[PDB]
Design a protein around this ligand. Structure first.
Ligand SMILES: CCCCCCCCCCC(CCCCCCCCCC)(CO[C@H]1O[C@@H](CO)[C@H](O[C@@H]2O[C@@H](CO)[C@H](O)[C@@H](O)[C@@H]2O)[C@@H](O)[C@@H]1O)CO[C@H]1O[C@@H](CO)[C@H](O[C@@H]2O[C@@H](CO)[C@H](O)[C@@H](O)[C@@H]2O)[C@@H](O)[C@H]1O
Ligand SMILES: CCCCCCCCCCCCCCCCCC(=O)O[C@@H](COC(=O)CCCCCCCCCCCCCCC)COP(=O)(O)OCC[N+](C)(C)C
Ligand SMILES: CCCCCCCCCCCCCCCCCCCC(=O)O[C@H](COC(=O)CCCCCCCCCCCCCC)COP(=O)(O)OCCN
Lengths: 244, 487, 75, 93, 67, 51
C-alpha cells in the first residue's frame, strides 16, 4: 500500500538501526541465554514462510516484501549463534541485503514511470531495454544467492556461523529455504527473458541519478567476490568493538 | 614469460572489449570474439610447452588474497591432470564460435559474450587449488549456460530444460557446500595442499565423501540423476550442446580426481564396490536404452553417459593404469562427443527435423560428411588407432588389476556400444534415398569441413602416439594414487 | 601490474557508460563526465586500498588486545 | 633457469619423518611421498630392464630357451612380484 | 531445404517424447520396475563384495568392513 | 539355429532394451517422485499460506 519511495526508505533504513539496537540489547541485557530460543524458532519460521509465500505472489511489491522477510530470517540466523563470527555474518548479511534492496527498489522505481503493477507487465523487457533487463536479472540472482555474485557471500558466511555453534538444524533449514527461494526468483527470470507476451508495455527512459546508483550497485554486486576484504575487516572490527 | 593469469584474463579482455562496441557492426563483434578465442587457445598451447613433467609439485601459482586473514585465497595452479582439461576447454570455445558463425546476425553480441564468459569461468575451474573457491566457480557456470540454453533453445519446451538443469544442480550442490563448511571449520583453511595433509576422523570421512559424491553424481551422469542430459541436451543449441557434453561432464570426474580421491583414501576403499555397481548398471541400462531411440540428439547423449560412467570404473580403481586411462578416455570423449554433436548440429541446421527416420541413404549426396561421420562414429567404437581405445582399454586393465567382475560388465558395455553405434550409422548413411521430404540439401561448405580437421588430427594423434600425453601425467597420477598410502 | 588506478579508472568509465546505456543513450554521450568518472574511480580505488591497509592494521591491534584479555583467565 | 639436463633429485630419504605419526609433520609429508613414488618407479624400470633382457634372450635362445636363460627368468619374476601399484600383491617397502 | 515433415511422424515422435502420461503402477510392471531397480543392483553388489572377500581370503589379510 | 539364436537373444535384447528401461526407469519413477511428477507440491501448496 505504501508509496514506492516510502517502501524504498523502509526495509533498509529502519531495519539497520533496529538491528544495531537489538545487537546492543542482546549482547548486554541478555545473559540468561533465553533469547537464543526465541530467535531460533522465529528465524526458522521466517525462512520457511517467506520462501513458501513469495512463490505464490503475482505482484512485485508483495514479492519484495516477502523477500525482505526471508532475508530478515537469514540475518536473524546470526542471533541464535552468539559468537564473533555470528555477529560478523549478521552484519555482512545486513550490508549486502541493504545494497540489493536499494538496487531492486531502483529497478521498481524505474518502471514506476509507466505504473508497473504485476509481474507479467515486465514481459519481453530484454527487447525494449536489454541492459535494464540484465541489471534486474543480476539483482534477482544476487537475491537468490547464486555463487558468482554478492548475496551468495552473505548466505555463505551466515551458514558458516550457524555451523560454528553446532546449530546443524539451522544450516539444513537455511539450505532448503534457499533451494525453494531460488525457484520463484528464476520464475521471475523466465517471464522477463524467455516467453514473450502478445502485448508489450513500453517504459520511458530513466534519469541520471537512478541510473548512476543502479550502475554502481550492479558493479558492486557482480565484482564483490573479487575483493571482499574491506567489508570482512570492517565487520570483524565492528563485532569486537561491542566489548573492546 | 607467460603465466597462468594471462590465460584467465584473455577471455575477460575479449568480453570487456566486445561490450564497448555497438551491435550494428556485427562483423567486428564476430571477428574480435574469434580472435580472442584463438589467442587464448595459442596461449594455452604455449603453457603446455613450458610444463615440467618431472616434479610432483604444482606449476605456476598466482595467489590473490580473498579473506583479510589470507585464510582462503585464489590459489591458481596446474598439474599433470589439470593441464589437458585447460587445453581442451581453450580448444573447444573457438569451435563453438565457429559453428554458429552464419547465424551471428540472429544471435547477437550476447552469444559471444556468454561463450567467452563460459571460457573464462571454465578455465578458472580447472587450474585452481582452493577447495572452497573451486566450489564457487564449480556451479558458477549455472548462469551463463542457463542463459545459453534458455534464450536460444527449443521451440516452447526450452523453459522446462532450463529448470531441470538448474534444479538438479541445487540440492546436491548445497549439500556439498555443507561439507565444504565443515571442512573449513574443522581444519581452518581450504588450501588443497593443507587439506591433503590432515588427519580426518574415520567416521567423518564417510559423511564428507558422501556429500562430495552427491554433488558429483549429478554432473557425472550416474544412475539416479542422469535424465537431464538427454532432454536438456536435445533442447539446447548446437554450440551449447558441444560444451555441455565436452566440459561440464568433466567437472564431476575432475572433482573426484582432485578433492575426493586424495583427501578420503580409506573412504574411497570402503565405498569402492558401491561405485562399481552403480557404474556397471549405468553402462548396461544406458546401452540397452539407447538402441531404441528416435531422437537425433539423445542417441549420442546416452553414448556420452555410457562413456562417462565407464570413466569412473577406472577412476575409482586406484592404479596408475586406471587413472591414466581415465583422463585419456576423458579427453578422447571430449573430442569424439563434440564431433558427433557438431555432425548432428549440421544435419539439423539444414533439414530441421530432430528425428532419425527422416534421414536415409544420403551417402550419394553428401560423401564428405559421410566419410567424416564414419570416422567419428568409428572413433566412438574405440578402435585401436583411435582416441577412445587406448584410454578405455587402460581403464579396463586398471580395474582388472583390482576387481574381476564389475569391469567385465564394463567390457560387456562395448559389446553393445559398437553394435548400436554402427546400427545408428546405418540408419542414416545407408539404403536408398527417399526424395519425398528431402527435396534439396547441400554438403559441408568451407567452414564446417575445416572445423573437423583439428578433430581428425587430434583423434589420430591420440590413437597412434599417446606417449606425449602419458609422459606429462605419470608423475601426477602416481602421486595421486600413493597419497595417504604409507607402508 | 594493475596499480589500483588501471582498475579504478576502468570501473569509473564502465559505470559511466553503464548509466549512460540505461537511459537508452549513446555510450559516449558526454565524454567530459566520462573523464570525471575515470578520475573519480581512480580516487575511490586508491582511497579504498589505503583504508583497507589502515583497517587491517587496526583490526590486528584489536585482535591482539582481545587475545591478551582472554589469556588472563588462565594466568 | 634450468639445468638443461636430467632432473637431478635427492636420493637421501627426507628427515623428520616418523611412521607412527606421519600426519604430525605436514612439511615433510610431500617430499617423503615424492621419494616413495620415485623409488617405486625405480623398481618399475628395473622390472622393465629385466623384461627387455628376456626380450633379447628369447630371440637368440632358439628352440631350447629354457636351458641357458632360466636364471634370468627368476630374476625377472621376483621383480614383478613387488611391482608398483598392481594386483592384490602390494609390496611393503 | 527444410523437410516436408509429413503429419504421420510427429505424433509418434511426441508419444515417444511424452510417454510420462502413461504410468499407473500396474502390478506386473511394479514387479518389473522393482526387480531391475533393487534386486539386480543388490545381486551385483554381492558379486563384487564377495569377489573382494575371496581375493582377500587367499592373501590371508583380514576382510575390510566395506560399509 | 539361425532362427533360434535370433529370437532367443537378439529379439529378446531388442525388446527388453526399451520395454523395461524406457518404461519403468529414466523418465518415469525417477520423474514422478522426482523433479516435477508429484514433488511439485508447491503449486498445490501455493494457495494455503495466504490465509
Ligand atoms: C571491486 C572489484 C575488484 C576487482 C579487482 C581485483 C584485482 C586484485 C587487485 C586489487 C588491488 C586494488 C583493489 C581495487 C578495488 C577496485 C576499486 C573498487 C571501487 C572502484 C571505484 C589490491 O590488491 C592488493 O592490495 C593489497 C593492499 O595491502 C593487499 O595485500 C595485502 O595487504 C595487507 C593488508 O594490510 C595484508 O596484510 C598483506 O597480506 C598483503 O600485503 C591485497 O588486497 C592485494 O595484494 C590491486 O593492488 C593495489 O593495491 C596496492 C598493493 O600494493 C598498491 O598500492 C600500494 O599503496 C601503499 C599501501 O598504502 C603501498 O605502500 C604501496 O607499496 C603500493 O603502491 C597498488 O599499486 C595496487 O597494486
Ligand atoms: C580410428 C580410425 C582408424 C583408421 C581407420 C581408417 C579406415 C578408413 C576410414 C574411412 C573408410 C571409408 C568410409 C567412408 C564412408 C563410406 C561411404 C562414403 O561416403 O564413401 C565416400 C568416400 O569414399 C571413400 O571411402 C574415401 C575415404 C578414404 C577411404 C580409404 C581410407 C584410406 C586412409 C585410411 C587408412 C590409412 C592407413 C592407416 C593410417 C595410419 C564416397 O564414396 P563414392 O564412391 O564417391 O560414392 C559416391 C556417392 N554417390 C554414389 C552418392 C555419388
Ligand atoms: C562499488 C564498486 C563499483 C562501483 C564503482 C563506482 C566508481 C566511482 C563512481 C563513478 C561515478 C562516475 C559518474 C560520472 C559523473 C557524473 C556526474 C553527473 C552529476 C550530475 O549531472 O548532476 C545531476 C545528476 O545527479 C547525480 O548524479 C547525483 C545523484 C547521484 C546518486 C549518488 C548517491 C550517493 C549516495 C549513496 C551512495 C550509495 C550508498 C549505498 C549503500 C544532474 O543530473 P542531469 O543534469 O543529468 O539532469 C537532471 C536529472 N535529475
Amino acid at each position: 500500500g505504501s508509496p514506492t519511495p516510502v517502501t524504498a526508505f523502509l526495509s533498509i533504513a529502519p531495519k539497520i538501526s533496529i538491528f544495531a539496537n537489538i545487537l546492543r540489547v542482546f549482547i548486554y541485557g541478555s545473559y540468561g541465554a533465553t533469547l537464543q530460543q526465541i530467535f531460533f524458532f522465529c528465524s526458522i519460521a521466517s525462512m520457511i514462510l517467506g520462501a513458501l509465500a513469495a512463490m505464490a505472489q503475482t505482484k512485485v511489491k508483495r514479492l519484495l516484501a516477502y523477500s525482505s522477510i526471508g532475508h530478515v530470517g537469514y540475518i536473524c540466523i546470526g542471533f541464535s549463534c552468539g559468537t564473533i563470527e555470528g555477529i560478523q555474518s549478521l552484519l555482512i548479511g545486513i550490508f549486502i541485503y541493504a545494497l540489493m534492496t536499494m538496487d531492486a527498489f531502483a529497478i521498481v522505481l524505474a518502471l514506476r514511470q509507466t505504473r508497473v503493477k504485476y509481474i507479467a507487465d515486465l514481459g519481453a523487457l530484454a527487447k525494449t531495454n536489454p541492459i535494464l533487463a540484465i541489471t534486474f536479472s543480476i539483482t534477482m540472482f544476487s537475491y537468490a544467492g547464486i555463487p558468482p555474485l554478492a548475496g551468495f557471500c552473505s548466505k555463505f558466511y551466515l551458514f558458516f556461523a550457524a555451523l560454528g555453534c553446532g546449530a546443524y538444524f539451522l544450516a539444513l533449514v537455511g539450505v532448503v529455504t534457499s533451494v525453494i527461494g531460488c525457484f520463484y526468483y528464476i520464475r521471475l527470470v523466465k517471464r522477463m527473458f524467455f516467453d514473450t507476451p502478445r502485448t508489450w508495455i513500453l517504459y520511458e527512459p530513466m534519469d541520471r541519478n537512478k541510473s548512476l546508483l543502479l550502475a554502481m550497485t550492479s558493479f558492486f554486486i557482480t565484482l564483490f567476490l573479487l575483493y571482499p576484504s574491506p567489508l570482512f575487516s570492517v565487520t570483524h572490527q565492528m563485532a569486537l568493538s561491542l566489548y573492546l | 614469460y607467460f603465466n597462468l593469469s594471462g590465460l584467465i584474463l584473455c577471455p575477460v579482455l575479449g568480453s570487456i572489449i566486445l561490450l564497448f562496441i555497438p551491435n550494428s557492426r556485427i562483423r567486428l563483434i564476430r571477428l574480435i570474439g574469434l580472435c580472442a578465442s584463438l589467442i587464448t587457445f595459442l596461449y594455452s598451447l604455449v603453457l603446455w610447452i613450458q610444463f615440467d613433467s618431472s616434479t610432483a609439485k604444482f606449476q605456476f601459482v598466482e595467489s590473490l588474497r580473498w579473506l583479510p586473514y589470507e585464510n582462503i585465497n585464489f590459489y591458481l595452479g596446474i598439474d599433470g591432470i589439470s593441464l589437458f582439461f585447460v587445453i581442451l576447454t581453450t580448444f573447444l570455445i573457438p569451435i563453438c564460435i565457429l559453428v554458429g558463425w552464419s547465424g551471428m546476425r540472429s544471435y547477437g553480441k550476447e552469444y559471444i559474450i556468454a561463450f567467452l564468459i563460459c571460457e573464462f569461468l571454465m578455465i578458472a575451474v580447472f587450474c585452481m587449488l582452493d577447495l572452497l573457491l573451486f566450489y564457487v566457480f564449480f556451479e558458477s557456470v549455472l548462469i551463463p549456460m542457463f542463459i545459453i540454453i534458455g534464450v536460444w533453445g527449443s521451440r516452447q519446451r526450452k523453459i522446462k530444460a532450463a529448470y531441470q538443469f538448474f534444479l538438479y544442480t541445487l540440492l546436491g550442490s548445497l549439500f556439498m557446500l555443507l561439507a565444504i563448511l565443515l571442512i573449513l571449520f574443522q581444519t581452518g583453511t581450504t588450501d588443497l595442499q593443507i587439506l591433503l595433509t590432515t588427519e580426518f576422523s574415520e567416521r567423518r570421512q564417510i559423511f564428507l565423501w558422501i556429500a562430495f559424491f552427491a554433488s558429483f553424481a549429478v554432473k557425472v551422469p550416474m544412475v539416479p540423476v542422469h535424465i537431464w542430459l538427454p532432454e536438456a541436451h536435445v533442447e539446447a543449441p548446437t554450440a551449447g550442446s558441444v560444451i555441455l557434453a565436452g566440459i561440464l561432464l568433466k567437472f564431476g570426474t575432475y572433482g573426484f580426481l582432485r578433492f575426493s580421491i586424495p583427501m578420503f583414501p580409506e573412504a574411497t576403499l570402503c565405498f569402492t564396490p558401491f561405485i562399481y555397481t552403480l557404474s556397471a548398471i549405468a553402462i548396461i541400462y544406458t546401452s540397452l536404452t539407447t538402441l531404441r531411440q528416435i531422437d537425433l540428439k539423445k542417441i549420442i547423449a546416452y553414448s556420452s553417459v555410457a562413456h562417462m560412467n565407464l570413466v569412473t570404473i577406472g577412476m575409482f580403481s586406484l592404479n596408475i593404469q586406471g587413472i591414466g586411462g581415465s583422463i585419456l578416455l576423458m579427453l578422447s570423449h571430449g573430442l569424439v562427443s563434440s564431433a558427433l554433436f557438431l555432425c548432428v548440429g549440421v544435419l539439423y541446421d539444414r533439414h530441421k527435423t530432430r528425428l532419425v527416420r527422416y534421414y536415409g541413404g544420403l551417402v550419394s549426396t553428401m560423401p564428405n560428411f559421410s566419410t567424416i561421420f564414419f570416422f567419428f562414429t568409428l572413433a566412438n567404437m574405440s578402435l585401436p588407432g583411435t582416441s577412445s581405445f587406448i584410454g578405455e582399454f587402460l581403464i579396463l586393465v586398471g580395474a582388472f588389476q583390482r576387481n574381476s567382475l564389475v569391469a567385465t560388465l564394463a567390457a560387456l558395455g562395448m559389446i553393445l556400444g559398437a553394435a548400436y553405434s554402427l546400427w545408428l550409422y546405418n540408419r542414416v548413411v545407408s539404403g536408398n534415398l527417399k526424395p519425398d521430404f528431402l527435396h534439396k540439401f547441400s554438403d559441408l561448405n568451407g567452414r564446417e569441413v575445416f572445423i573437423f580437421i583439428p578433430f581428425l588430427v587430434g583423434l589420430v594423434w591420440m590413437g597412434v602416439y599417446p606417449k606425449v600425453f602419458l609422459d606429462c601425467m605419470h608423475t601426477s597420477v602416481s602421486n595421486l594414487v600413493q597419497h595417504g598410502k604409507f607402508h | 601490474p594493475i596499480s589500483a588506478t588501471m582498475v579504478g579508472a576502468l570501473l569509473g568509465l564502465g559505470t559511466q557508460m553503464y548509466s549512460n546505456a540505461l537511459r537508452k543513450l549513446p555510450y559516449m554521450r558526454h565524454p567530459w563526465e566520462h573523464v570525471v568518472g575515470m578520475g573519480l574511480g581512480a580516487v575511490f580505488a586508491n582511497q579504498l586500498v589505503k583504508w583497507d591497509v589502515k583497517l587491517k592494521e587496526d583490526l590486528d591491534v584489536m585482535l591482539a588486545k582481545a587475545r591478551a584479555a582472554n589469556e588472563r583467565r588462565y594466568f | 633457469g634450468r639445468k638443461k639436463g636430467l632432473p637431478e633429485f635427492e636420493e637421501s630419504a627426507p628427515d623428520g619423518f616418523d611412521p607412527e605419526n606421519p600426519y604430525k609433520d605436514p612439511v615433510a609429508m610431500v617430499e617423503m611421498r615424492e621419494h616413495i613414488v620415485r623409488e617405486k618407479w625405480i623398481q618399475i624400470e628395473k622390472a622393465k630392464i629385466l623384461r627387455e633382457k628376456v626380450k633379447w634372450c628369447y630371440r637368440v635362445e632358439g628352440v631350447n630357451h629354457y636351458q641357458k636363460c632360466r636364471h634370468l627368468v627368476q630374476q625377472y619374476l621376483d621383480s614383478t612380484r613387488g611391482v608398483g601399484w598392481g594386483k592384490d600383491h602390494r609390496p611393503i617397502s | 531445404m527444410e523437410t516436408n515433415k509429413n503429419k504421420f511422424i510427429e505424433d509418434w515422435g511426441s508419444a515417444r517424447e511424452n510417454l510420462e502420461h502413461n504410468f499407473r503402477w500396474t502390478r506386473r510392471n511394479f514387479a518389473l520396475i522393482g526387480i531391475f531397480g533393487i534386486a539386480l543392483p543388490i545381486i551385483v553388489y554381492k558379486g563384487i563384495v564377495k569377489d573382494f572377500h575371496m581375493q582377500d581370503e587367499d592373501a590371508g589379510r583380514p576382510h575390510r568392513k566395506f560399509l | 539355429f539361425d532362427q533360434v539364436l535370433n529370437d532367443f537373444l537378439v529379439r529378446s535384447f531388442l525388446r527388453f532394451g526399451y520395454e523395461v528401461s524406457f518404461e519403468a526407469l529414466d523418465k518415469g519413477a525417477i520423474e514422478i517422485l522426482g523433479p516435477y511428477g508429484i514433488s511439485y507440491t508447491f503449486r498445490r501448496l501455493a494457495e494455503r499460506i495466504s490465509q
